[PDB]
Design a protein around this ligand. Structure first.
Ligand SMILES: [Zn+2]
Ligand SMILES: [Zn+2]
Lengths: 147, 38, 114, 138, 97, 87, 134
């Protein structure tokens, strides 16, 4: 597309109990990280790497409109499997989804958003390395990935 | 003769004289890289 | 190449042009903030991307016991005879057979390729 | 001089109880927080949930100044404790346990797009023109 | 017991660090959870290996993996991991005598 | 599984809260297992040997018991806490 | 001047404080009495181009704790307190971070093992029952 190939390749997230995926940056907005620098700090640990910074540009533009945590939570709640009757209930549902359903192994406590942002950023960071070719793709057959 | 081969591109003068003067180059740059056939 | 962040809301700064002065300006979005651009390059991509692997190589790899070690390539920085050699083995290269050497002397993470 | 070999030793005191609790306030380095302009500030519990188990809201210089939100550290220090040493005239260090750890980040102030407004932009999210212009119209 | 020991040693919790410090340090993962970062990965692995071999805090079935290139230490304690006994070799010699 | 997982599963289960307004709570704490037992027609328990299970087409199963504590509140500033040991 | 106002006087004086990470046993011993007004002495030794921090445990308390400093330029830390009379104040700004480590290495794990075992007491396990419940 004209503008489709200009921004590049954008990253989305398929969170549980959501019918349709959401932009990755939106999930960071919901977790409480609003500014781009705060979000990118959890994804790119070395700002001196121009290659990594470009990979996240299309993702930032996709979620440019959403600029507040409550706005982001409503967007996540709006796409929930059981959309809320009102906007306030949508935010509560989205908060519950991220609180327990998203990355539960990281934590389920009400104050684990920071830990979930780091791991989610690590998931994005790992994806960028695969996209950049810096790290080899995981092997399903590798038996240390099995239980 | 120069060790580096270069090709400078700029938008038409008539349009300069609607989408975006900056983003449009990226659309052209991406479009020319793949869609254009040499 | 340089990525700039707003000084008010710590958001991304995108390039913008002021017709009044005809000088590149990095203007924050949703922040009515502007900055004086100096690089003059807003976007650059290298299709060949001949990015040096030595920059990517981490000196800690010299502690890997699974890497081969050669005494025939002494370190230039310190002269340590022992060195640990390996291949990049990273995608986008299409030809990964050259060896990169890392000095095994502690505190000397010198990296070189022959 | 004496500073080249100065040795200082002070007594450590641990009062059983204090009227005021001690907690850590953390600011990110990139925030460039400066207290010179902090003429006035307000710290209170949030009202979004609508108390002791809710986030803390920090406001500086009223609405004009920057606003920060503090969140309790989810990770508990079951195997760790934190103490702060404060200089006193008696010359003996005093250590107070950290009741809580709070992380504060700045909150940007501007005409942020509302939830209803974001719905319209969702139509053009895939295809949008002149990202700068979207804020100007609002 | 692994997390308690890691906190005692020079491992900084994720909450109590600035993101600028994560670049040089190695991420510490326990059962897939990024517990924190550590500035001396080599010494930690030697200490972690020593404890497991002495069976002090780390049980025999706990596997510690250091990805030197990726600057990551992965500690796995969950079930379902297939392992086998191997003789330890130090300085090109068997510890079995 | 028997020594840890079963007990953890019972412990991790949320307490049962019921409202009528009298309020009822059920909390399960301790798990007990008896040796594999078989009950005769008369109802007399007896240890079940694996060969007898094989011969008589029985299931080699051990009875499972759980200590249940029940607390009831009847908005009368009184609380009654009754525990059923080895349910 | 209001209830929510923060007494930022401590920030004005630029008072410096030290953040120290210590294990539980050291604090647990302090928590034992916690009212004698004394738990030990903090000794700091400085040389021409090196500084070392160490702490000594009180003899009565027992019946060496070397300290390692950490960089504080990567994060700015401040200390504030909330008064019971609803009067918040800022004690000061953290200027240095330190951590406490155990002098012993082998027998120290023995104390840790006891703590791990002690914290395992609430860990309930299924109990074999000799006689079927009747
Ligand atoms: Zn801005
Ligand atoms: Zn060398």
């Amino acid at each position: 597309g004209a503008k489709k190939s200009a921004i590049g390749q954008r990253i989305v997230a398929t969170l549980p109990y959501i019918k349709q995926e959401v932009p990755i940056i939106i999930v960071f907005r919901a977790l409480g990280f609003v500014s781009d620098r705060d979000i990118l700090e959890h994804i790119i640990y070395d700002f001196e790497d121009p290659e990594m910074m470009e990979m996240v540009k299309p993702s930032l533009d996709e979620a440019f409109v959403i600029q507040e945590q409550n706005v982001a939570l409503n967007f996540i709640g709006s796409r929930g499997a059981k959309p809320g009757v009102t906007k306030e209930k949508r935010i509560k549902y989205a908060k519950e989804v991220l609180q327990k359903e998203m990355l539960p192994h990281v934590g389920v406590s009400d104050f684990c958003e920071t830990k979930k942002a780091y791991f989610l950023g690590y998931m994005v960071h790992r994806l960028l390395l695969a996209a950049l070719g810096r790290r080899e793709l995981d092997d399903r057959d590798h038996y240390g990935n099995k239980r | 003769n120069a060790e580096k081969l270069v090709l400078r591109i700029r938008i038409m003068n008539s349009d300069e004289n609607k989408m975006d003067d900056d983003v449009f180059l990226r659309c052209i740059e991406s479009n020319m890289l793949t869609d254009m056939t040499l | 190449v340089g990525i700039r962040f707003c000084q008010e809301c710590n958001n991304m700064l995108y390039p913008k042009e002021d017709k009044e002065n005809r000088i590149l300006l990095y203007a924050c979005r949703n922040c009515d903030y502007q900055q004086e651009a100096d690089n003059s390059c807003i976007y650059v991509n290298k299709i060949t991307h001949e990015v040096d692997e030595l920059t990517q190589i981490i000196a800690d790899v010299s502690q890997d016991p699974t890497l081969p070690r050669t005494e025939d390539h002494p370190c230039q920085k310190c002269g340590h005879k022992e060195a640990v050699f390996f291949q990049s083995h990273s995608a986008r290269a299409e030809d990964a057979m050259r060896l990169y050497y890392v000095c095994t002397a502690p505190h000397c993470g010198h990296r070189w390729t022959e | 001089g004496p500073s080249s070999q100065n040795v200082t030793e002070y007594v450590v005191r641990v009062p059983k109880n204090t009227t005021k609790k001690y907690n850590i306030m953390a600011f990110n380095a990139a925030d460039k927080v400066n207290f010179a302009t902090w003429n006035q500030a307000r710290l209170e519990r949030d009202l979004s949930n609508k108390p002791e188990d809710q986030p803390w809201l920090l406001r500086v210089n009223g609405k004009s100044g920057r606003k920060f939100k503090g969140i309790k550290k989810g990770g508990v220090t079951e195997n760790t404790s934190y103490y702060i040493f404060t200089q006193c005239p008696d010359g003996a260090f005093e250590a107070f346990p950290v009741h809580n750890w709070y992380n504060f980040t700045p909150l940007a102030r501007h005409r942020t797009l509302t939830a209803e407004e974001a719905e319209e932009e969702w139509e053009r999210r895939n295809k949008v023109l002149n990202h700068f212009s979207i804020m100007q119209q609002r | 017991p692994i997390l308690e020991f890691l906190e005692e040693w020079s491992m900084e919790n994720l909450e109590e660090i600035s993101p600028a410090a994560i670049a040089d340090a190695t991420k510490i993962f326990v059962n897939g959870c990024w517990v924190g970062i550590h500035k001396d990965p080599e010494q930690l692995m030697n200490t972690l290996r020593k404890l497991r071999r002495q069976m002090d805090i780390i049980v025999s079935e706990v596997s510690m993996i250091r990805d030197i290139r990726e600057r990551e230490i992965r500690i796995y304690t969950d079930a379902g991991r297939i392992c086998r006994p191997l003789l330890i070799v130090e300085k090109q010699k068997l510890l079995l005598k | 599984f028997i020594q840890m997982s079963v007990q953890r599963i019972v412990e991790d289960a949320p307490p049962i809260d019921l409202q009528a307004p009298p309020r009822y709570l059920l909390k399960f704490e301790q798990i007990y297992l008896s040796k594999p037992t078989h009950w005769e027609r008369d109802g007399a328990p007896s240890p079940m040997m694996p060969n007898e299970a094989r011969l008589r087409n029985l299931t080699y199963s051990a009875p499972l018991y759980v200590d249940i504590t029940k607390t009831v509140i009847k908005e009368g500033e009184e609380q009654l806490q009754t525990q059923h040991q080895k349910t | 001047a209001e209830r929510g106002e923060l007494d930022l006087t401590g920030a004005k004086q630029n008072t410096g404080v030290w953040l120290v990470k210590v294990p539980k046993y050291l604090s647990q011993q302090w928590a034992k009495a916690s009212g004698r007004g004394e738990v030990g002495k903090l000794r700091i030794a400085k040389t021409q181009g090196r500084t070392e921090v160490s702490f000594t445990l009180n003899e009565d308390l027992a019946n060496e704790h070397p300290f390692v400093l950490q960089s504080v330029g990567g994060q700015t830390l401040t200390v504030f307190t909330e008064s019971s009379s609803d009067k918040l104040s800022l004690e000061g700004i953290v200027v240095q971070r330190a951590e406490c480590r155990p002098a012993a290495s082998e027998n120290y794990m023995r104390l840790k093992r006891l703590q791990i075992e002690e914290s395992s007491k609430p860990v309930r396990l299924s109990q074999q029952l000799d006689k079927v419940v009747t």
